[PDB]
């Protein structure tokens, strides 16, 4: 499969999440995603085919993981924006106030602004700390997906948000949305990963 940020993958033929970013770990191909999407050794599929397994994760506390892929997978420096792509250029962290977008298999490509940093989310499994908050909307299934600026700087991976009864927060105003991502930089250093850029 071609590995693009925001696309759907399944975990142990059960849950669905979204790809974060193509990365390498030496010769090993991979993608980063959210920790809550799978446990270590869980099997990832795209297009019905096995593409790899969860190599490592931290969740809760953080919400980070990477999936180590078979050598047959094709890593791409891209994030889905409808039928087009945003090119991944780097991982410079944007400041509060910056515009930012996110990509995932439920609500697609959505934009907003970064409204706060170092936010704690309390999930059923425990607290997750250090999250960045934006007001781009999102929904169930968008987890793991890319957060990236329009200029191509990869920010993080979708962790959670204040979804409403319809499964997303796209039906309430931006001012009322809390959409939270796990920062990319600590995932890269934690697992010795390098971002695929183009």
């Amino acid at each position: 499969a071609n590995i693009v940020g925001g696309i759907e993958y399944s975990i142990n033929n059960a849950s669905l999440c979204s790809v974060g970013f193509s990365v390498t770990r030496g010769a090993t191909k991979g993608f980063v995603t959210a920790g809550h999407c799978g446990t270590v050794n869980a099997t990832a599929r795209i297009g019905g085919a096995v593409v790899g397994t969860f190599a490592a994760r931290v969740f809760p506390g953080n919400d980070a993981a990477w999936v180590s892929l078979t050598s047959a997978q094709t890593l791409l420096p891209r994030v889905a924006n409808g039928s087009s792509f945003v090119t991944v250029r780097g991982s410079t962290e944007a400041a509060v106030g910056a515009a930012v977008c996110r990509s995932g298999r439920t609500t697609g490509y959505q934009c907003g602004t970064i409204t706060a940093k170092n936010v704690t989310a309390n999930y059923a499994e425990g607290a997750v700390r250090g999250l960045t908050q934006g007001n781009a909307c999102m929904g169930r299934g968008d987890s793991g997906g890319s957060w990236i600026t329009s200029a191509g700087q990869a920010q993080g991976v979708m962790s959670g948000g204040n979804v409403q009864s319809n499964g997303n927060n796209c039906g309430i105003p931006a001012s009322q949305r809390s959409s939270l991502f796990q920062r990319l930089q600590p995932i890269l250093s934690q697992y010795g990963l390098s971002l695929v850029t183009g």
Binding site: H36, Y123, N162, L180
Partner: peptide
């Protein structure tokens, strides 16, 4: 996930 949903913050609670």
């Amino acid at each position: 996930l949903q913050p609670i």
